[PDB]
Design an enzyme around this catalytic site. Structure first.
Site, PDB file in Angstrom:
ATOM      1  CD  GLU A  33       9.952  -0.229   1.403  1.00  0.00           C
ATOM      2  OE1 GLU A  33       9.547  -1.276   1.931  1.00  0.00           O
ATOM      3  OE2 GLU A  33      10.797   0.531   1.944  1.00  0.00           O
ATOM      4  CG  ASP A  47      13.277  -5.917   3.397  1.00  0.00           C
ATOM      5  OD1 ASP A  47      13.657  -4.937   4.093  1.00  0.00           O
ATOM      6  OD2 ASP A  47      12.939  -5.824   2.196  1.00  0.00           O
TER       7      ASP A  47
HETATM    8  C1  LIG Z   1       7.366   2.782   9.105  1.00  0.00           C
HETATM    9  C2  LIG Z   1       7.906   1.423   8.705  1.00  0.00           C
HETATM   10  C3  LIG Z   1       6.915   0.648   7.841  1.00  0.00           C
HETATM   11  C4  LIG Z   1       7.534  -0.652   7.332  1.00  0.00           C
HETATM   12  C5  LIG Z   1       7.112  -0.957   5.896  1.00  0.00           C
HETATM   13  C6  LIG Z   1       8.099  -1.867   5.165  1.00  0.00           C
HETATM   14  C7  LIG Z   1       9.449  -1.192   4.926  1.00  0.00           C
HETATM   15  C8  LIG Z   1      10.531  -2.189   4.507  1.00  0.00           C
HETATM   16  S1  LIG Z   1      11.609  -1.533   3.815  1.00  0.00           S
HETATM   17  C9  LIG Z   1      12.789  -2.330   3.610  1.00  0.00           C
HETATM   18  O1  LIG Z   1      13.829  -1.766   4.435  1.00  0.00           O
HETATM   19  C10 LIG Z   1      15.183  -2.181   4.200  1.00  0.00           C
HETATM   20  C11 LIG Z   1      16.126  -1.464   5.192  1.00  0.00           C
HETATM   21  O2  LIG Z   1      15.626  -0.156   5.519  1.00  0.00           O
HETATM   22  C12 LIG Z   1      15.520  -1.896   2.738  1.00  0.00           C
HETATM   23  O3  LIG Z   1      16.870  -2.237   2.468  1.00  0.00           O
HETATM   24  C13 LIG Z   1      14.613  -2.734   1.840  1.00  0.00           C
HETATM   25  O4  LIG Z   1      14.959  -2.562   0.457  1.00  0.00           O
HETATM   26  C14 LIG Z   1      13.145  -2.390   2.105  1.00  0.00           C
HETATM   27  O5  LIG Z   1      12.342  -3.391   1.474  1.00  0.00           O
END
Ligand SMILES: CCCCCCCCS[C@@H]1O[C@H](CO)[C@@H](O)[C@H](O)[C@H]1O
Ligand SMILES: *[C@@H]1O[C@H](CO)[C@@H](O[C@@H]2O[C@H](CO)[C@@H](O[C@@H]3O[C@H](CO[C@@H]4O[C@H](CO)[C@@H](O)[C@H](O)[C@@H]4O[C@@H]4O[C@H](CO)[C@@H](O)[C@H](O)[C@H]4NC(C)=O)[C@@H](O)[C@H](O)[C@@H]3O)[C@H](O)[C@H]2NC(C)=O)[C@H](O)[C@H]1NC(C)=O
Ligand SMILES: *[C@@H]1O[C@H](CO)[C@@H](O[C@@H]2O[C@H](CO)[C@@H](O[C@@H]3O[C@H](CO)[C@@H](O)[C@H](O)[C@@H]3O)[C@H](O)[C@H]2NC(C)=O)[C@H](O[C@@H]2O[C@@H](C)[C@@H](O)[C@@H](O)[C@@H]2O)[C@H]1NC(C)=O
Ligand SMILES: *[C@@H]1O[C@H](CO)[C@@H](O[C@@H]2O[C@H](CO)[C@@H](O[C@@H]3O[C@H](CO)[C@@H](O)[C@H](O)[C@@H]3O)[C@H](O)[C@H]2NC(C)=O)[C@H](O)[C@H]1NC(C)=O
Length: 602
Positions: A491, A285
């Site tokens: 989230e 992730d």
């Molecule tokens: C401003 C950025 C702050 C970061 C906070 C955590 C964000 C993680 S998200 C994450 O991103 C992936 C691709 O985007 C998705 O596929 C997932 O399901 C999701 O869990």
């Protein structure tokens, strides 16, 4: 020389082995690197032999960018990757999780929880099919979907991304996979990756594993459960994904019994790869490896070592690729990570790329551009939205005339509430922006617009967002439709311990329903405190996050179709009961899983 890996007529395994055997360490580590479009440049992609790009939530070339703009962007990146010595095409990923939701004018489907309410896996397959077309319309080859979390506590901000608290319903909804990717062959070996061709996308079963089981529904937190409970609640749908040829698996930020998923070699290698025989690639992730440590990113060298040794194949960096590449290179150069581990990761990444046709069709198809927001797909989203609605109440007493379905012909009617004319609110999170947004953010039909499009020409429709009691009593209304609920979230921003809707919401329902009989439409990603809304309302519908096609709501309200949705989750009496699931020792729901009132078409 003849170059086997470039020969389209050769078996995937042969092409994989031929290419791998030609690659430098730099080229190998490059394949394992996924970077944000925001840090990508022709030189960066070329010089670092980059394997993948993604758009995170709201990472778009322009606001209101056309499908062609997206294609040109993706092709520009591809051109750079194709110019390397080996010309390995990049794979571009995106969160297309209820349609191609980052993209302006994309069809926005109901979020997963509402899909679970439909109990219709074939509808979900068709959504996967439509979603593949709209993702390909934008030149993108890879969707980070389905989320197969089993949300066991609605205080979790991602509960709406889970089809059900019941693993069996989540299992059934894995039909999104062959929708997105195409149906696997008769002969198919479970755990092998599959994508049918250029009109389909790679899918991603996420987030492995037990993301839906965290304490207090705290996002990215600890899931405290024995192996038996992990295996019979949170794991089962991963095996269904294997059987359907899911191409990739994303690892969860969450921990299991205090062990970070991104560092768990036993589960990622021991179970997913060696037991389930997963042959696709395993992706991190977003900054997932960084978050292995506390504070996050405080020992990035350990982050790289632990994740790569755990068995992850591709790292969603997504920004600081230079540090990632340099650190991984050093670990390999010093023998801390063996070549066999690097070669396995690269084998799996190439396997997926060769399998899906990426070497044969690395560039976008401009003829696909018009698949975006296609009316047939909108009709489907409209069908899904209607099918997702759960009627919780239809009459205050057993002897009342049922309010729903409402007549299309009445002298004057009222549409009210913060959610009655707000497209962004009805789509929820992961729509245009990461967090979702308010107002007219895309092409769609609000509940108000749907009402206006549904009623007899002689029916006067009045809109008032927050009318007082006197306005309603004095209005000469036959009935009111009042829509309220949660604001968009994604989230950790959606983690919520009280689960009460923002005000004004209840007060508007009370002011409206106190003056005229009312159908309350509740927009939420999850069960929320509902007794007070229920007490005020003649009828009440749990509409979840129905997406761009608000006519799905009025299709049921006005009796074009009967109500059929059933709760895919337990509805709690109060938050201090939580966690509380069907089968528990002290199960005392307001509405049990599977509850849903019905109507018939008029
Ligand atoms: C401003 C950025 C702050 C970061 C906070 C955590 C964000 C993680 S998200 C994450 O991103 C992936 C691709 O985007 C998705 O596929 C997932 O399901 C999701 O869990
Ligand atoms: C039960 O717990 C919940 C979760 O903790 C509580 O909800 C959250 O409260 C916090 C702290 O007050 C909020 O953070 C603030 O947000 C402000 C910005 O305004 C918001 O914008 C967010 C998106 O950017 C929305 O998600 C929010 O709902 C809110 O939007 C506005 O809300 C108004 C009230 O209904 C409405 O009138 C506006 O129209 C609407 N606007 C939009 C754009 O939709 C910041 O200025 C603050 O600095 C602070 O960060 C948090 O946003 C909020 N909700 C969510 C989804 O995270 C809840 O308060 C609690 N309930 C009880 C009973 O106590
Ligand atoms: C009036 O309202 C109810 C809607 O709840 C209709 O009955 C229901 O019809 C469903 C499908 O027509 C039944 O099937 C079940 O759902 C799935 C599909 O997701 C099926 O694959 C599965 O086999 C299920 O059994 C559902 O059971 C049924 N509900 C109940 C408890 O009666 C009703 O439809 C009419 O009666 C039913 C019993 C069927 O014979 C229908 O074909 C028939 O139309 C609606 N009435 C009318 C006249 O439209
Ligand atoms: C699950 O969630 C809990 C609650 O958020 C996590 O515990 C929290 O962890 C953070 C550290 O990441 C703590 O913040 C830190 O506190 C120290 C101590 O004073 C301070 O020096 C740092 O600057 C930082 O602010 C936080 O206190 C802590 N919350 C509490 C009170 O328990 C927990 O780590 C999560 N578990 C998993 C597996 O993710």
């Amino acid at each position: 020389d003849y170059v086997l890996y470039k020969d389209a007529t050769k078996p995937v395994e042969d092409r994989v082995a031929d290419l791998l055997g030609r690659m430098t360490l730099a080229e190998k580590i490059g394949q394992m690197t996924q970077i944000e479009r925001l840090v990508a440049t022709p030189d960066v992609l070329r010089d670092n032999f980059i394997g993948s790009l993604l758009s995170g939530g709201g990472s778009v070339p322009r606001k209101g960018a056309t499908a062609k703009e997206w294609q040109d962007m993706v092709d520009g990146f591809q051109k750079a990757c194709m110019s390397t010595r080996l010309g390995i095409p990049m794979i571009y990923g995106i969160d297309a999780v209820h349609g191609q939701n980052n993209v302006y004018g994309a069809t926005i489907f109901p979020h997963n929880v509402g899909l679970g309410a439909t109990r219709d896996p074939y509808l979900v397959k068709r959504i996967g099919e439509a979603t593949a077309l709209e993702v390909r319309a934008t030149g993108i080859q890879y969707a980070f979907a389905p989320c197969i979390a089993v949300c066991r506590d609605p205080r979790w901000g991602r509960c709406y991304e889970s089809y059900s608290e019941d693993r069996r319903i989540v299992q059934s909804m894995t039909e999104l996979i062959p929708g997105l990717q195409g149906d696997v062959p008769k002969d198919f070996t479970s755990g092998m990756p599959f994508v049918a061709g250029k009109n389909k996308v790679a899918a991603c079963a996420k987030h492995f594993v037990g993301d839906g089981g965290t304490v207090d529904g705290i996002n990215e937190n600890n899931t405290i459960i024995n192996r038996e409970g992990l295996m019979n609640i949170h794991m089962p749908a991963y095996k269904n994904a294997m059987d359907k040829g899911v191409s990739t698996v994303m690892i969860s930020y969450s921990s299991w019994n205090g062990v970070k998923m991104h560092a768990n070699q036993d589960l990622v290698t021991g179970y997913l790869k060696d037991t389930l025989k997963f042959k696709g690639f395993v992706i991190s992730d977003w900054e997932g490896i960084d978050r292995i440590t506390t504070p996050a990113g405080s020992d990035y060298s350990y982050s790289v070592k632990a994740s790569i040794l755990a068995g992850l194949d591709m790292i969603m960096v997504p920004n600081k690729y230079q540090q990632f590449i340099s650190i991984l290179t050093g670990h390999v150069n010093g023998g801390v990570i063996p070549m066999s581990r690097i070669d396995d990761a690269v084998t799996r990444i190439l396997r997926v790329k060769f399998t899906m046709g990426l070497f044969e069709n690395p560039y976008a198809d401009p003829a696909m551009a018009e698949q975006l927001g296609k009316q047939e797909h909108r009709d489907l989203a409209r069908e899904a939205a209607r099918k997702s609605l759960v009627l919780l109440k239809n009459g205050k007493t057993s002897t009342d005339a049922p309010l729903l379905p409402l007549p299309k012909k009445a002298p004057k009617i009222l549409v009210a509430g913060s959610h009655a004319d707000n497209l962004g609110y009805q789509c929820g999170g992961w729509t245009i922006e990461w967090q979702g947004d308010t107002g007219r953010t895309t092409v769609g039909t609000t509940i108000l617009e749907a009402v206006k499009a549904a009623v007899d020409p002689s029916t006067v429709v009045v809109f008032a967002e927050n009318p007082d009691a006197e306005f309603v009593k004095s209005g000469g209304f036959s009935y009111a439709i009042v829509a309220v609920g949660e604001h968009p979230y994604t989230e950790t921003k959606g983690d919520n311990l009280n689960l009460t809707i923002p005000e004004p919401g209840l007060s508007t329902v009370q002011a409206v329903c106190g003056g005229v009989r009312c159908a309350t439409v509740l927009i939420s990603g999850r069960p929320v405190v509902v007794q007070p809304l229920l007490a005020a309302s003649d009828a009440l519908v749990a509409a979840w996050l129905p997406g761009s096609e608000g006519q799905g709501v009025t299709d049921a309200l006005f009796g074009d179709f009967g109500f059929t949705g059933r709760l895919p989750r337990t509805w709690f009496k109060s938050v201090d009961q939580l966690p509380m699931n069907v089968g528990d020792a002290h199960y005392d729901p307001l509405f049990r899983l599977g509850y849903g009132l019905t109507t018939n078409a008029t």
